[PDB]
Nucleic acid binder design. Structure first.
Ligand SMILES: [Mg+2]
Ligand SMILES: [Mg+2]
Ligand SMILES: [Mg+2]
Lengths: 136, 141, 45, 94
RNA sequence: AGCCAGGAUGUUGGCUUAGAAGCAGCCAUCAUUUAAAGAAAGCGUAAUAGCUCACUGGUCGAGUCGGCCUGCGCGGAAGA
């Protein structure tokens, strides 16, 4: 499960998530799974989806994960007053903007990557679309 | 040729005649004799050799017995005592187990006076090559 | 029969599975192997 | 071989370009060599299909603007972030 | 699309486990007669099986298939 091995600071301002995605082409594989919505992918989400596409291909071909959850998310538990300090880091997300290539894959037939990316797509909280490598 | 009228296959080797442990219970009962599996069975077995399994046609309109006339021995039965091993596929394709040759089986396959495919003694012969493959040997042709 | 808010799967559980729009719901009929029937909906209010 | 029909842009900037794309057209640009760049407007559907054959990105295409012929090669392309659409193209005079 | 056909031979497939004859699982996925016919498609299983299809010959006779950009709608939708 992905997580920064170490970081400069423990916690991070909430911030916002406007803008379009960077890194928008299939730049490693042959096929890609691309983001259509704006939002958060958790380290567990990336994993639930990664397993499925890897199940799906019987660990053939090759898989790239283009996103990484480097954003620490905190939460305040039950029975806690507001304030008295910032919550504790509980999990990690990567921020997703429309257009982010999430996963790439190659070494498999077009038909099979689609099944596999379809299977992962069911694990994610944002709409996605299936893409291909392109000259230029 | 006409339709469906009694016909089943299930033995092990022809140098026997009716054995028990294979089938025993299930080898005839819509007018077919278990006990009779001899007179007809060895109606052409003794006259050549004992040790190629040849199953064969029933035939029962509403009779109490059956006749059938037999045909040629199988093909797989030509890869234990004539060309290579018996463990069969062994481990069919992790190593290549053993091997045959172009000479081997062409003659033996080529004595079939009642079974195979093709007027070319070679096409039918080439087909026989495929079985040897089912158990992962080698091509030396 | 089972309900389901999705027939993508229950439509292909068998060759005679059809999909029909009786009244205004979508039923997956299959009159040979009925156990494979489904609907998408469940009535008015 | 590939033949593309273009009109010169009469406007420029973000508003105009967003309006061009709202009209199923899209801006593009022609540059290179001694002549000045030529801002042009292309038909979206027609060019989408053309550029869907790898041949497009390596063969010399011909753009037609007022019955004059410009020989170019595709040089860059900006695509929609997530739709099968084109936002813009660079052509260089071959 | 429909309906008539066929769907044959190496091969009852060798072989992994107690059957196996595609009949479970792993291995490969060869081969002939042809009009095509998968060492299989999945129901089924004491072994047969006895089903249909995948694929092709006939019949009909002019359309048919399902992806793309998009508009409005459908279902998803239970509370005092
Ligand atoms: Mg009613
Ligand atoms: Mg503005
Ligand atoms: Mg037809």
């Amino acid at each position: 499960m992905l997580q920064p091995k170490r970081t400069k600071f423990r916690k991070m301002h909430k911030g916002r998530n406007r803008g379009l995605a960077q890194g928008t082409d299939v730049s490693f594989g042959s096929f890609g799974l691309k983001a259509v919505g704006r939002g958060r992918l958790t380290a567990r989400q990336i994993e639930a989806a990664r397993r499925a596409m890897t199940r799906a291909v019987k660990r053939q071909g090759k898989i790239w994960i283009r996103v990484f959850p480097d954003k620490p998310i905190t939460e305040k538990p039950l029975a806690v007053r507001m304030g008295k300090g910032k919550g504790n880091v509980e999990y990690w997300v990567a921020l997703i903007q429309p257009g982010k290539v999430l996963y790439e894959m190659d070494g498999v037939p077009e038909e099979l990557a689609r099944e596999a990316f379809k299977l992962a797509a069911a694990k994610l909280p944002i709409k996605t679309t299936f893409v291909t490598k392109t000259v230029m | 040729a006409k339709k469906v009228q009694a016909y089943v296959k299930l033995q092990v080797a022809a140098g026997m005649a009716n054995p028990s442990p294979p089938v025993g219970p299930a080898l005839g009962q819509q007018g077919v004799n278990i006990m009779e599996f001899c007179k007809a069975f060895n109606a052409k077995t003794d006259s050549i050799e004992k040790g190629l399994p040849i199953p064969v046609v029933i035939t029962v309109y509403a009779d109490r017995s059956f006749t059938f006339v037999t045909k040629t021995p199988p093909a797989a039965v030509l890869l234990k005592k004539a060309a290579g091993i018996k463990s069969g596929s062994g481990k069919p394709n992790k190593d290549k187990v053993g091997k045959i040759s172009r000479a081997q089986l062409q003659e033996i396959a080529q004595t079939k006076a009642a079974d195979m495919t093709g007027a070319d003694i070679e096409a039918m012969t080439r087909s026989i090559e495929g079985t040897a493959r089912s158990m992962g040997l080698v091509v030396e042709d | 029969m089972k309900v389901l808010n999705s027939l993508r799967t229950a439509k292909e559980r068998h060759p005679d599975c059809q999909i029909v729009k009786r009244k205004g719901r979508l039923y997956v009929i299959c009159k040979s192997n009925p156990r494979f029937k489904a609907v998408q909906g469940r009535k008015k209010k | 071989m590939f033949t593309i029909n273009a009109e010169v842009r009469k406007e420029q900037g973000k508003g105009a370009s967003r309006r061009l794309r709202a009209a199923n057209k899209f801006p593009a640009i022609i540059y290179g060599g001694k002549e000045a760049p030529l801002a042009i407007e292309l038909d979206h559907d027609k060019v989408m299909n053309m550029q869907a054959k790898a041949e497009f990105y390596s063969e010399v295409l011909t753009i037609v603007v007022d019955g004059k012929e410009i020989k170019v090669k595709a040089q860059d392309v900006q695509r929609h972030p997530y739709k099968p659409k084109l936002q813009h193209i660079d052509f260089v005079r071959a």
